Amino acid sequence: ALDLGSAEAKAWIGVENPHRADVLTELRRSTVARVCTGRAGPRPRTQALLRFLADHSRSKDTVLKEVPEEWVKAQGLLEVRSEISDKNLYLTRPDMGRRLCAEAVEALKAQCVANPDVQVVISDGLSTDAITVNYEEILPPLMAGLKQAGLKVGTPFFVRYGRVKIEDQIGEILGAKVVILLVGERPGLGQSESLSCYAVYSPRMATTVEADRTCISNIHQGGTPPVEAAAVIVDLAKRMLEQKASGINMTR
């Protein structure tokens, strides 16, 4: 009897007549990649394929799930959205996900700290789980660390149906010297928790190119710990302010 979502299923070694079976377990705990499941001729073994399919069915589900509005309120976050009205349209209209709606532009001018040094934006992007799971761990150390021995911190807010280039528009509206976007990545097969940070210095919709952003990817318990991440983000914003540059424009 076996649950394909169980940890026992994930650790299963399927190599038959191995050369050194102890090495196999050593290799198995070295990585989250699906190593050491063996083979049937050149095809995957039955259990390996079943666990793949199981994980896919779960992965697909994470794509359409939305963070409830009540979650964002219980975090004290202002919510605006892009021009996107729903999750299905979100998947097909990246051009609209990169643009704030007309009400979002006004809500930001009305309720957000003007001309901050560092402006923090949160968005579901392609993965709700990457926010709901990591949020409490990364966001307070980040907001606190920017204050401590710090500077003018903008009002953090949540953007529904957001794409990365929408941070250029937020920067222009707010006069932010540095804009920090925490966003969910497209979900992987085995987990949907991976969050990344895209940060840019003094963006301008007209001229900023994508290489002008610095990316910090794979923030989650299996990648860079969310607490640990906030600290590298703080330092990065310090350097962007020092250097007046972001992405490929920073020294080193």
């Binding site: 190599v15 989250v32 990649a33 050491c36 979900p187 991976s194």
Partner: protein, 453 residues
């Protein structure tokens, strides 16, 4: 040139070459999103007919981004052999299609003819090809390159070992490498998409790859797919150089989005010649894929197949060891489902082989596209019959840090044994000495990474 035709008694009129190129495409979500797609099957067919009746000169003289505005247009236009162009300039695209597919057209005939093309012409041919046309046409245009392995010889099939980790953990990377080699994967390259884009970490990942290469005397090359400038810097500081990689896009503005100047690719070639551990003459690696220019706001109203062909025209200038489309890497907004991803993979491979580059394909999809692993298995077999130069390999195709599914190490062994194809001959020799392969087949003790211990 005609920009109209009558179909079932109705006139189908088009505004310019760029629109005919766009509406001729098989339907895909990206062309709809770009606003350039045909309104209906009828208008698509009418566009194909108008396109089939245009000449090579019609399309060569109408690049989708003007020469004086785009260094990629200039690079493509300036590399034309004008003697080969003059011989074909009055051929209709319909005649060029039939010439490529003819069994009376030899590999050497195409070698000269393709030098008279520009990427827009290459795209034009692909647009009026059925799926079997794209497969058969590509199969009769082999492209062979050599680094420390030879890739592209008809009857062979290579694979990139792609051992990625969420933290660039060198133990996770090694673990995937041993597993991949044990299935015969890695004759194209052992190439890592790094998480941290910094010199010391690239060296660590390169040192890890080359520790395995050096320990078992493997004929192959390593690569870390960071930005090309950080690769150059790491190699100049002593990291082991194998292939030097860069993502490319089909317009100057798209290259700026990536932070790439053409001078950097010139620099990568010179750095490879001064530093890189490569026996053969080819050491660059590019990756491409439909939708990148549209994503960058850099398609200038052209469709994604024409833009992707311009990638191959850019690549050809630098004579790389390998190029591959990353066919469904991005999402449903550019290629929605199975049908569209297969069609684009066949197109991409066909255009890359017609442009004379060493064309492989990362057969892949994402979890927000309407696709599943059976699609990867469908496409990898079709492209293999097309003579695709290599695919990727990961454990069961699950990438734990790029969050998409590619092909398994299993899939390369399956393709090779299904179709009686061999690895690169130098790598096959190595697999034989390791006891992993005999007569193109995995031995009983293969597929077991602990064999290396």
């Amino acid at each position: 040139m005609k920009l109209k035709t009558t179909l079932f008694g109705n006139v189908y009129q088009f505004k310019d070459v760029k629109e005919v190129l766009a509406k001729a495409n098989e339907l895909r979500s990206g062309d709809v999103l770009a606003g350039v797609a045909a309104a209906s099957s009828q208008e698509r067919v009418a566009a194909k007919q108008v396109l089939s009746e245009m000449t090579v000169a019609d399309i060569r003289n109408n690049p989708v981004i003007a020469y004086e505005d785009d260094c990629v247009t200039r690079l493509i236009q300036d590399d034309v052999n004008e003697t080969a162009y003059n011989q074909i300039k009055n051929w209709s695209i319909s005649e060029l299609r039939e010439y490529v597919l003819s069994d009376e057209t030899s590999v050497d005939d195409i070698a000269f003819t393709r030098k008279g093309l520009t990427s827009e012409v290459v795209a034009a041919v692909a647009k009026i090809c059925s799926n079997a046309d794209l497969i058969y046409g590509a199969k009769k245009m082999p492209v062979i390159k050599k680094a420390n392995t030879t890739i592209g010889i008809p009857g062979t099939f290579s694979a990139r070992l792609q051992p990625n980790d969420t933290r660039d953990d060198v133990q996770s990377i090694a673990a995937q490498i041993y597993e991949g080699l044990s299935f015969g994967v890695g004759d194209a390259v052992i190439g890592v998409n790094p998480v941290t884009d910094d010199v010391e970490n690239l060296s660590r990942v390169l040192d890890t790859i080359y520790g395995v290469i050096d320990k078992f005397n493997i004929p192959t090359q390593g690569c870390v797919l960071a930005h090309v400038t950080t690769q150059i810097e790491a190699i100049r500081r002593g990291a082991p150089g194998g292939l030097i990689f860069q993502s490319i896009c089909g317009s100057e503005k798209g290259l700026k989005e990536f932070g790439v100047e053409l001078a950097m690719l010139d620099e990568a070639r010179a750095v490879g010649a001064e530093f890189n551990r490569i026996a053969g003459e080819n050491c660059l690696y590019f990756e491409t894929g439909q939708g990148s220019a549209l994503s960058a706001g850099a398609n200038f109203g052209a469709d994604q197949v024409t833009m992707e062909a311009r990638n191959y025209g850019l690549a050809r200038h630098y004579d790389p060891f390998i190029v591959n489309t990353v066919v469904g890497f991005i999402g449903p907004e550019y290629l929605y489902n199975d049908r569209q991803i297969i069609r684009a993979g066949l197109e991409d491979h066909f255009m890359g082989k017609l442009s004379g580059i060493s064309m492989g394909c990362d057969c892949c999809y994402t979890n927000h596209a309407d696709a599943d692993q059976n699609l990867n298995e469908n496409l990898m077999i079709l492209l293999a019959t097309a003579g695709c130069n290599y695919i990727m390999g990961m454990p069961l195709g699950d990438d734990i840090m790029l969050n998409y599914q590619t092909t398994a190490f299993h899939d390369t062994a399956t393709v090779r044994q299904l179709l009686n194809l061999r690895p690169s001959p130098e790598f096959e020799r190595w697999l034989e000495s390791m006891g992993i392969m005999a007569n193109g087949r995995l031995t009983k003790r293969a597929g077991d990474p602990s064999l290396f211990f």
